[PDB]
Amino acid sequence: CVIPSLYLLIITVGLLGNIMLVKIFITNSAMRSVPNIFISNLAAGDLLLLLTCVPVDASRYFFDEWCKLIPVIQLTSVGVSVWTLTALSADRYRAIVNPMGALLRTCVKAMGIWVVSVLLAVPEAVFSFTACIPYPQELHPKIHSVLIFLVYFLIPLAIISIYYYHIAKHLKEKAKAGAEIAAHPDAFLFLLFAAFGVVLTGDPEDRALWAELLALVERAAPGIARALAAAYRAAEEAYRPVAGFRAGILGACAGLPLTARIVDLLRTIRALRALRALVDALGAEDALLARLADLALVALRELAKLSESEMDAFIADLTAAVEAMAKQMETRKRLAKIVLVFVGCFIFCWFPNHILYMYRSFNYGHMIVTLVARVLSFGNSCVNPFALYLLS
Numbered sequence: 001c002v003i004p005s006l007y008l009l010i011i012t013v014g015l016l017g018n019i020m021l022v023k024i025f026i027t028n029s030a031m032r033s034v035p036n037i038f039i040s041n042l043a044a045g046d047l048l049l050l051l052t053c054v055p056v057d058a059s060r061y062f063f064d065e066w067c068k069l070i071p072v073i074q075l076t077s078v079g080v081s082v083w084t085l086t087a088l089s090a091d092r093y094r095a096i097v098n099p100m101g102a103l104l105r106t107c108v109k110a111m112g113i114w115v116v117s118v119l120l121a122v123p124e125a126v127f128s129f130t131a132c133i134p135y136p137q138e139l140h141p142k143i144h145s146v147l148i149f150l151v152y153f154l155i156p157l158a159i160i161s162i163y164y165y166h167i168a169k170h171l172k173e174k175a176k177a178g179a180e181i182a183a184h185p186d187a188f189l190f191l192l193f194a195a196f197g198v199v200l201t202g203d204p205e206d207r208a209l210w211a212e213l214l215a216l217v218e219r220a221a222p223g224i225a226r227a228l229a230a231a232y233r234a235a236e237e238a239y240r241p242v243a244g245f246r247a248g249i250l251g252a253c254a255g256l257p258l259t260a261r262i263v264d265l266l267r268t269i270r271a272l273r274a275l276r277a278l279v280d281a282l283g284a285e286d287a288l289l290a291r292l293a294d295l296a297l298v299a300l301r302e303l304a305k306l307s308e309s310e311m312d313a314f315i316a317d318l319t320a321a322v323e324a325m326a327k328q329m330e331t332r333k334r335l336a337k338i339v340l341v342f343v344g345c346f347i348f349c350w351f352p353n354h355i356l357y358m359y360r361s362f363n364y365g366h367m368i369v370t371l372v373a374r375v376l377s378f379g380n381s382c383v384n385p386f387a388l389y390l391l392s
Ligand SMILES: C[C@@](Cc1c[nH]c2ccccc12)(NC(=O)Nc1ccc([N+](=O)[O-])cc1)C(=O)NCC1(c2ccccn2)CCCCC1
Pocket: 049, 053, 056, 067, 070, 071, 072, 074, 075, 078, 124, 127, 128, 132, 134, 135, 136, 140, 141, 142, 144, 148, 149, 152, 353, 354, 357, 358, 364, 377
């Protein structure tokens, strides 16, 4: 009575959720990216699992008589789901860290995971009255169940956790910076102008001491040094001056106060060409230091070769790009936490199923635990789209 009602309710909820998910993907394929395609693959896998797990239970409940392909399809479904979760976590890591023909590559990766799943579900058809009983009559069931646990639960979630460790680390470093580049500034936002004279004067007589200055800053300020290194790398790449300056400032302002103080310093330098006094004041916070101040003054002079109207457009573009990059990072972390919710619900719902299936290899509230575990397995697919609906 209670069990059939709750089972039908959750089955309907999950089927409707996955159908709505895939239908939304079909309708709005015009807005579909790596994450959208991967959650589409997840929805397809979950829906196939539902459609192949309903009939066996229905036949075993409302009948007593009923084998080589259904378990293959079910294992294919679970493999597709979990490996697409892994690929989605990898996408989140590669999109959050590195950007602090692609879509076709994601599509062929989806094809690849489908194919490797249907190839890894081949052994199922080997060993699967009128009751389709795969379990024959010691080591084969346990070994197969452990293999399914490893291939389908353990290493995929392990990869997801590994690639979220370096999504937490990146944000922790970005938080350490800003706080460090705002407490005792003018070591930053001045060396950031001694990292542009190096770009301007390409002679090795500048970079030879610029590398040493970066090493000293790292010995004295880690976040400042990493921001300066990213700034100079971007500036050198985009130089081949204004583009180099924009790239350097953008890379530096990536781990709120820094943009404001830098805009103020640029405005002050716009009318200094007594610039030496301002450079000395900025660098107040050792002949190598004098040479670095000279290079910073060179970069300030280069910036001075810009009209009042021209510099305003430059600072406006720079601050707009800073804001856009911050917003994109926030959106990326929001999608990362949504996928983390997906992984959490998946583990909470599929750990009981996996542990019970590993235990059942021994036996090749028992009924109530079995039915609640199956309802939980379906509830995973129930709450994936519910999580995406509520969180987004
Ligand atoms: C799909 C089926 C049952 C099945 C076997 N026939 C059928 C005919 C019709 C409908 C269903 C079946 N498949 C095997 O159990 N296959 C197997 C059995 C014994 C041995 N052995 O003894 O070595 C080796 C392999 C199975 O419960 N998956 C195990 C899992 C699962 C549970 C619920 C829903 C989906 N997925 C899939 C992920 C790992 C743990 C749970």
